[PDB]
């Protein structure tokens, strides 16, 4: 509309209305020029790719993309508390995206010093993939999402994708994608871009911990009319065989007949956070649960949803079982245990097997007069009829949605890193600096982004008499307030925050 | 565990009538409810009564509007391993209240 | 902590009171005032703070 008239205002806040929450977030972004406007082939052998399991082939593009797919984008810590303490469930409904107050800059080195000034004729290209024709990279827990703290300015990530490969070489079925082939909108410093999205119907992400365990659902006061086999022998001696039977009742609860059985397991190795009680060998890769695809071994991470440890063992975590977050200011490679934050899935133990334990036992043979009964450990167990399980929890730092791969079939599409699986997730938003001339003007753009999600809530109806567990802040006096910036102005998140505090009956 | 209301004494004047043990001072508090067993005959039949009482109060709330960024202090029960659940009965069936609970957790600016 | 307190019977002789028509009433709980300075958890102000009994607490002493 004009160079001297602003194209949009600054909206950040949350409106709590009844069963719904509306969270608006507005950030200031900066987009450079990537690859000097050049689509480029990339593969492992460029960096040497010494492992076959690491072999990849794909392209890096000039375009950038916005990623708001982590929760702390949309929720302040306070708003996250109000959500998790008061609600049994939630899920997104509507999405509203806006891109405005674009500004483009040109970079020049005059004499020995660098110069930057407004380029008022330059444009920015932006488009959304609403037919989902491009490779969808959002659901891969990538870095580069909108910053948790609104006063930070962030650098848009460079889009890219991969396709089929054999070793580092491509194949005849491989694909290539020119984002320029998509109709896009072009924006001058007076233009602004917006669109509205509609989440597809998804189940509420449960945010509660069961107050009953799957094997304790019985009435403690009453016997069962069913019978179990108590004794196979009368006593010590020869030819003592017998069959005795007993009522399943309160005195012995292990053997009662039950209608439902815990969810599936794929065993993880168990690592202790006290190092001296860990095997003295490198088992990070050699001892890890993996799955092989087309000859390549992928680590199983995080894997099926399983409790992190038995009750009473808090120093043990699954090797690839849980989500691990870094503390503010943590180095990219080989950091110490204190620097990282390891999340735990103890809340779901009531219905899910422990990740480091065998699912159970099965008989391996037929007993006979000459053969004793023999059993073996079930290390992994697929779905059986009558299993129940809980999904993995979502965190303030964790992902929100993923795209369900488009396939003939799937089971329980809910993604393994947590969040809402969707066949048509929020579409990707691609952006780039229009090239201004293989010799171009060095140029970058900056502007604002606002995003608005409407969340639906499931209120807590419970009749529990005694008070709940609630997420709270300790009243101890410390040098810096938690979830606030320090003297140098750095914002940090002290710990991961789960969603499961309130309880329900099983 | 504390009191709810008190009756503001009927006097010429008072200042900040809010009662000192806490709660809502009122000139016309909830009225007293008196009850007795009708005497059945100075020699009477030894007699007592029993029954039910239900009471219903409607409370108005003031919602928390704060813009505070970092998370509040909240009243919570710790995750503990003990013989008895708090705010519940023991083996002999006795109900107990483990600690006094105050009303002040959320914060405001001064 | 009992050792810090003075070794004398000052429970009634040291208490804030108000007199009405010749009778002394203890000041309880009194005006609303903070119980202790910051970082001084051990101290309590005599009659100033409400005191509740635990379940099964004896009536006297």
């Amino acid at each position, epitope marked *: 509309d004009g160079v001297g008239s602003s194209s949009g205002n600054w909206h950040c806040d949350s409106q709590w209305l009844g069963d719904r929450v509306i969270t608006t977030s507005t950030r200031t972004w900066a987009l450079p020029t990537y690859n000097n406007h050049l689509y480029k082939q990339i593969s492992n052998s460029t960096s040497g790719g010494s492992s076959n399991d690491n072999a990849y082939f794909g392209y890096s593009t000039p375009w950038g993309y916005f990623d708001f797919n982590r929760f702390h984008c949309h929720f302040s810590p306070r708003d996250w508390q109000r959500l998790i303490n008061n609600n049994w469930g939630f899920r997104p409904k509507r999405l509203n995206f806006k891109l405005f107050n674009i500004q483009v800059k040109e970079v020049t080195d005059n004499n020995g010093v660098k110069t930057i000034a407004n380029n008022l004729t330059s444009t920015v290209q932006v488009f959304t993939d609403s037919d989902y024709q491009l490779p969808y990279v959002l659901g891969s827990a990538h870095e580069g999402c909108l910053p948790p703290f609104p006063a930070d300015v962030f650098m848009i990530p460079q889009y890219g994708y991969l396709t089929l490969n054999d070793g580092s070489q491509a194949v005849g079925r491989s694909s290539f994608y020119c984002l320029e082939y998509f109709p896009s909108q072009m924006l001058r410093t007076g233009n602004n871009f917006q669109f509205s999205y509609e989440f597809e119907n998804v189940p509420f992400h449960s945010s509660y911990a069961h107050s009953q365990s799957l094997d304790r659902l019985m009435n403690p006061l009453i016997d069962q009319y069913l019978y179990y086999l108590s004794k196979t022998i009368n006593g010590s001696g020869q030819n003592q065989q017998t069959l005795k039977f007993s009522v399943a009742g309160p005195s012995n609860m292990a053997v009662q007949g039950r209608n439902y059985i815990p969810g599936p397991s794929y065993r993880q190795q168990r690592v202790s956070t006290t190092v001296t009680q860990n095997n003295n060998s490198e088992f990070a890769w050699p001892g890890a649960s993996s799955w092989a695809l087309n000859g390549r071994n992928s680590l199983m991470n995080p894997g099926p949803a399983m409790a992190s440890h038995k009750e*009473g063992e808090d120093r043990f975590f699954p090797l690839s079982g849980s989500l691990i977050f870094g503390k503010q200011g943590t180095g990219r490679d080989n950091v110490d245990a204190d620097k990282v934050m390891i999340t735990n899935e103890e809340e779901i133990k009531t219905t899910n097997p422990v990740a480091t334990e065998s699912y159970g036992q099965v008989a391996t043979n037929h007993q006979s007069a000459q053969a004793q009964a023999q059993t073996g450990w079930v290390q992994n167990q697929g779905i059986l009829p009558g299993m129940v399980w809980q999904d993995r929890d979502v965190y303030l730092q964790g992902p929100i949605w993923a795209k369900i791969p488009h396939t003939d079939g799937n089971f329980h599409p809910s993604p393994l890193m947590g969040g809402f699986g969707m066949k048509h997730p929020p579409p990707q938003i691609l952006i780039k600096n229009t090239p201004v001339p293989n010799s171009f003007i060095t140029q970058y753009s900056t502007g604002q982004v606002s995003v608005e999600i409407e969340w639906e809530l499931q209120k807590e109806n419970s009749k529990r008499w005694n008070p709940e567990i609630q997420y709270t802040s300790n009243y101890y006096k410390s040098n810096n307030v938690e979830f606030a910036v320090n003297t140098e102005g750095v914002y940090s998140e002290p710990r991961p925050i789960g969603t499961r505090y309130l309880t329900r009956n099983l | 565990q504390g009191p709810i209301w008190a009756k503001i004494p009927h006097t010429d004047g008072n200042f900040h009538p809010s009662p000192l043990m806490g709660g809502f001072g009122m000139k016309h508090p909830p009225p007293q409810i008196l009850i007795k067993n009708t005497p059945v005959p100075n020699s009477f039949i030894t007699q007592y009564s029993t029954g039910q009482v239900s009471v219903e109060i409607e409370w108005e709330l003031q919602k928390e509007n704060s813009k505070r960024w970092n998370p509040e202090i909240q009243y919570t029960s710790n995750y503990y391993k003990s*013989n008895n659940v708090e705010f519940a009965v023991n083996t002999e069936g006795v109900y107990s209240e483990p600690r006094p609970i105050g009303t002040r957790y959320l914060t405001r600016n001064l | 902590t009992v050792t810090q307190n003075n070794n004398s019977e000052f429970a009634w002789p040291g208490a804030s009171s108000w007199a009405l028509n010749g009778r002394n009433s203890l000041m309880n709980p009194g005006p609303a005032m903070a119980s202790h300075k910051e970082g*001084e958890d051990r101290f309590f102000p005599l009659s100033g703070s409400l005191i509740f009994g635990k379940q099964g607490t004896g009536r006297d002493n």
Partner: antibody
Amino acid sequence: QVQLQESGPGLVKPSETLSLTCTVSGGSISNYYWNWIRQPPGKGLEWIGYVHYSGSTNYNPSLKSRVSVSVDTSKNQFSLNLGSVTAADTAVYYCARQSRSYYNEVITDPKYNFDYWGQGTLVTVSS
Amino acid sequence: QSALTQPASVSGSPGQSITISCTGTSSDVGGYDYVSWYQQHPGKAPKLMIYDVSNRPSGVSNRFSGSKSGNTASLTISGLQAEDEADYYCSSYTSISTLVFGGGTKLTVLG
């Protein structure tokens, strides 16, 4: 992860004052109660006393005369000064931390259950 | 004050519950429900197994348990193992708000 470390001279001549400092790392002194425990070699634990950032202290009645415990919030360390030592004071000295109280509801003195411990230092009292 | 009194040593075979006791005066133990149990491996700092008579911290197995009758508090170790051999100390809050420890008890796992 809170770690405590005791430091100080390992040898003390009789009738001289003994001095030790515990430096907490990973966590600040905060609202916690810092305690000193000593174990004579091959004998049971004994509680020396504690200190609080308000400067409050509580001492073992048998040692109350000759002992002192100080806190420095700036340097994030608290100290032990035990005077007029004899050979009965040879022991391993631990610094410990009173467990955090989750409730601010009542006014009470601390009940001692220790959450963290130093590694301990041996201090020999000899001529 | 006067120390709490414990047996010097207790032994048991792996798999068998074991009970250690500490006797204290009415003012120190009998009076309040604040008795802690510490295990100490040789050369290590004590670890807190049980606090507030029967409570236990996170990180301690079911097998450890404690109880109080009169002037005597008792620590029970169920289904004991090899790693469970250590010195166990009774701790108590006193009338004058002082801490008092038991003499210590050594647990030997027969085998």
